[PDB]
Ligand binder design. Structure first.
Ligand SMILES: O=c1[nH]cc(F)c(=O)[nH]1
Ligand SMILES: O=c1[nH]cc(F)c(=O)[nH]1
Ligand SMILES: O=c1[nH]cc(F)c(=O)[nH]1
Ligand SMILES: O=c1[nH]cc(F)c(=O)[nH]1
Ligand SMILES: O=c1[nH]cc(F)c(=O)[nH]1
Ligand SMILES: O=c1[nH]cc(F)c(=O)[nH]1
Ligand SMILES: OC[C@H]1OC=C(O)[C@@H]1O
Ligand SMILES: OC[C@H]1OC=C(O)[C@@H]1O
Ligand SMILES: OC[C@H]1OC=C(O)[C@@H]1O
Ligand SMILES: OC[C@H]1OC=C(O)[C@@H]1O
Ligand SMILES: OC[C@H]1OC=C(O)[C@@H]1O
Ligand SMILES: OC[C@H]1OC=C(O)[C@@H]1O
Lengths: 240, 247, 238, 241, 243, 243
């Protein structure tokens, strides 16, 4: 391995410069199977990596695991191996009543409720997505006629208190996060997830292109995975 | 007289307008409105000069913000009260990347929040991000007139001098927090410095208002008073063209 | 001109070292008229500059516009041109019940609810007024017999949510500022305005003298006068 | 399942109240193998769970994945299912010259260079290990005669800039982290790893017991002994039943 | 004197490397009196110092006064004079219902509600007690059979608003501290006192060993002389085990 | 036996005093009181020594705060409960400007808040500003005795050592946050370092109490009994003007 965690060398990538990065290791082969000549390259910890061919060009699919820290490792090591464009495809809970389960969300920038982003840029730096990547994702979405919303996402280091869930062992939330969901809702934030603040900040601050799409699996105020996967693959096609 | 405390405007004055172009300089307001049909001066108090005009048969506002987040926040708030829902900022900027030339046009996707006013609308972790439709329109508009365009992140400072790490000043020094900061933003790919976008983008993105940001490069902090006029005009045509796409 | 924004040269100031700095560019000529030999020097953006004379000495009057950011430009550029003493004269909203519209407020120091002050000194540094400047303002106010209150001011980068106004487009205020007015009230803070934290910090941290006086125009519970005091204080500071 | 991620029911644990929590899903079976009647319960995302038996008492082995966020999910959901004691066994880079590759480190408390801990307690709250767990880990280490150091650990949300590595794509480190390693060294900090701040803070602030032990696999100033750290954590678990 | 505040020379310590550090200058003699050959060395400001002998070895007793700032001077200056181990013995208010007046609390680590700790290490660094010291205190407590609790302590730069007391001149508490006591209670914090965050941080970040024990003199949800005596016996016995 | 928890004073003991001079050092209390009429010791507990005396026929209090914001905050709170409304701190300080000489007296208009206790009264953005009348009284008093006097900003630290960027210590290092800090304060015109004013000024200005601050310079970082006496004469004269 050329890198500490992924168990990959630059030769393994066959010159690929674009990666699709789902959170779940099990989703990797599913994404790769939509493309040509899919092959498994490696699997270590939460990092499962497949290579495939899109319009004759090699593309990588690599899982990040849950959270900014594991995401930061995958992105950095892929960047060392030559990846320059990163498309995250995820699952999220919507926090707006007009967003329905099954819809797709394209993130322009994220509320940084994570710690890893701070390791790349101070808090005042925006966790903003690459304009070309966002454009490609929005177009891909419309391309298959998915119901699409574009806007801000809250990206949390936690699934529970950081997303103001009380269905927990302790049944309480630290002061800092009390009333936070209502605040983000009032500010128009679409959804919660757990990797975008780290991904977008680390790429935007290092000259790497990143974009973010997710299928809504729940709505906190009130099939889809395959929809979102089709979209991220089609967006990749436009960025090759 | 007015339905708002600072701008001296009534809702009837806007005649149903829902989009506003907001330059920083009061003197650029007439310049912008003239590019459009039926310009008429509405009001002028403090740093806020407001003209109405017409675009493809649609009423549009041009209103100056003055320098800085705090005067910007007043203008944006009061226009929103009067019914404005889309704000397009047209400004001047100092570039900090060598590959960016005077005369180029910058479209901001999002801003580093080196301001105080953004914090009155959202905590620091919230991104000072531009609306996607507005940014798209600005980028499409710049390509329409064939300007040299860069799209990316801008640092938005509450100060012209120490916050942009200028040392050619009365004290000649910069507080610890900002020492070495220009080099940091440069390394992080930041295109330029200006003084209003963090406030504008944060206050709009957190209140359901659409906002975009374009600026003409008038200096490069790594590398003509006449060019400053040509660049301005280049940037002005772009924001008007973008406006037409957002009606 | 010797400076980027103000459109002034050092010779323009004619040796002046004291400036009176209103927020409103429209108030400049008004203030300068109270003194001798008033003449317009320049007007660009929110920056209108007149020169005048007080007891035979040249003095500047220059608008800052609204907010710390434009204030920081004006002060820096005036300092480059030789100004050493800055007297702000402003308008304010009182937040104590006992303070009446028409009263005059002299600021000893400000709560830093601004961004620009941080570009000169970290938050722990006090946005404190110069002692001589404050003295002259308080004596001038007792001189003409205005009802004066002396104390701490909250200086905000916003007119609306940072002063906890709810009469707005959104009708809401970000968590950080909910209940803030009541908090400043309990701490004995007199008023809100929008430039003093930046002015006082930038001057106190660079060896410049600054003072701050304002006229109450609203009471969050319930000009010619303030201007008169600021002019008389200037005389005492020449 | 009774929980959103781990795919486990309370019945699956069979009354277990203690869990050993490695970072790596592939280490789970190895740990369970040291005990009696090991059986695999589930595997979803980076969460692999086995159950085994220690002195005839049921115990859980469940991987956290890398980082505070996935750790926070594992700990929370395990707590919902009845777990009250958590013992992390990890790998680490030592940052003191006197500490040798292969040594075992027991963490009394962590420097909080993570984000998830803040979702449980404000920064001023200490990321401190439970006294009984720490005592059990030290005694176990003593028991098997391993070279052991006891002290403070730096727990980072990143492997790279948060541990002030410059051998990277960008080759630079954000201002906040420049000179940080030398600072922790001067302050006697033993090592870096990536989950303890979240684990210790979330447990200490919710009445759950947690301890942390790790095998040194690199020395930033300078055979993995994973198996060495593993025997100690199992022996410590025995003392905590 | 070899130091700026304590009025002590290295020779005064007679080779001592352990100090017991009460907050109250008046408690110093009481503690020393439990030991052999107690002798008064100096008294300046809030810093009263005695020397004594514990199992034949010289030990120091030195008051810190109230608060991290004076504590930081005493610990620094004692370190210059050769002290490497610091055991604080204090008085505290319990904030858990199950903890009674007269109980003894041993602190594993502290919530840093102080300013002085920040002068030694950034806030993310834990105000954690030395493991050997904590162990000695817990074993000493069991030895004399006191009702003992072991855990986290909130260490505040104020006695009043920082401990959310409203029985005060102003009757109010600044926003940051409103609702704070209930938050610490929910997080299992045992008690409030005013010196441990500074002590534990400054020691843990400089290779010095520190421990912290206190007697409960009030319960904030629900004798003082006796309590003081119990805690003093424990800190002395712990010191014996750390020689 | 006491109306307050730490000071050991009842309100009747104050005999209607509404002003207190508050030195840091308990041992300076009697000295200050001896400048006035009918001085009597009231109490001594911990670092809090209190005397009462008479100035121009009016009762006045002298009460030591100990070193640091935390003990200061206790003294001020409990004195305020006892009826004190005006507080004049008299301290010793290290100058950090070349033009300020040893023996000079400094009047503080406001302080840099390098402390923790001030945060327990007001958030950091609130100014640790002195009362205008007290400052005026101190400046006039200083002119009255013809001391060499400077008026300005003071840096108020929770530590004597790393917070004042001293390297003459056991560990010989300073945490990143304070590296290069002294040069920065100097550049900003800060006059001096001491350890109680940020807490005193903040807690007073935010609770309707009057506070002023004067100190004698006993060291200059860039370049003591008599100096003490000079500042003491000034604080007593300022007190006369504030009765
Ligand atoms: O981070 C999240 N992922 C998926 C969800 F459904 C959710 O609510 N939060
Ligand atoms: O804020 C700025 N506006 C314009 C400039 F040229 C510049 O450098 N900075
Ligand atoms: O900044 C302000 N100026 C004037 C006012 F009346 C007010 O309330 N706030
Ligand atoms: O987090 C870490 N784990 C393992 C290492 F070797 C290291 O350096 N850092
Ligand atoms: O700091 C404290 N010491 C003693 C107490 F009783 C208390 O409540 N708080
Ligand atoms: O806090 C201080 N008091 C006295 C001094 F001389 C000094 O330098 N610092
Ligand atoms: O279930 C939690 C996961 O879904 C969304 C994310 O971002 C998390 O990884
Ligand atoms: O000259 C400063 C102005 O130019 C750019 C900005 O943003 C400021 O308004
Ligand atoms: O209305 C806003 C103006 O009034 C008071 C201030 O300080 C602002 O400049
Ligand atoms: O390789 C990174 C892993 O090692 C130590 C940790 O804490 C991480 O999980
Ligand atoms: O009463 C105040 C004292 O008690 C506990 C502490 O830590 C203080 O020194
Ligand atoms: O020696 C320390 C003392 O001097 C100045 C202060 O404020 C401290 O109390």
């Amino acid at each position: 391995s050329d890198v500490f965690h992924l168990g990959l060398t630059k030769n393994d990538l066959q010159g690929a410069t674009l990666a699709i990065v789902p959170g779940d290791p099990d989703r990797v082969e599913k994404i790769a199977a939509l493309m040509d000549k899919p092959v498994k390259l490696a699997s270590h910890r939460e990092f499962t990596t497949w290579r495939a061919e899109l319009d004759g060009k090699p593309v990588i699919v690599c899982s990040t695991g849950i959270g900014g820290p594991s995401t930061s490792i995958a992105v950095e090591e892929l960047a060392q191996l030559g990846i320059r464009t990163f498309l995250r495809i995820g699952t999220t809970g919507a926090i707006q009543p007009h967003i329905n389960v099954g819809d797709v969300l394209v993130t322009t920038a994220s509320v940084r409720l994570d710690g890893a982003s701070l390791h790349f840029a101070p808090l005042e730096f925006p966790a903003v997505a690459d304009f070309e990547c966002t454009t490609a994702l929005v177009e891909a979405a419309k391309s298959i006629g998915a119901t699409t919303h574009v806007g801000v996402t809250a990206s949390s280091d936690t699934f529970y208190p950081g997303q103001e869930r009380y269905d927990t062992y302790s049944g309480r939330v630290v002061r800092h996060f009390k009333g936070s969901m209502e605040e983000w809702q009032a500010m128009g934030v679409m959804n919660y997830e757990m990797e975008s603040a780290t991904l977008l900040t680390m790429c935007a601050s290092q000259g790497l292109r990143a974009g973010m799409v997710a299928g809504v699996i729940v709505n906190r105020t009130q099939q889809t995975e395959s929809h979102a996967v089709k979209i991220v693959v089609e967006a990749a096609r436009r960025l090759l």
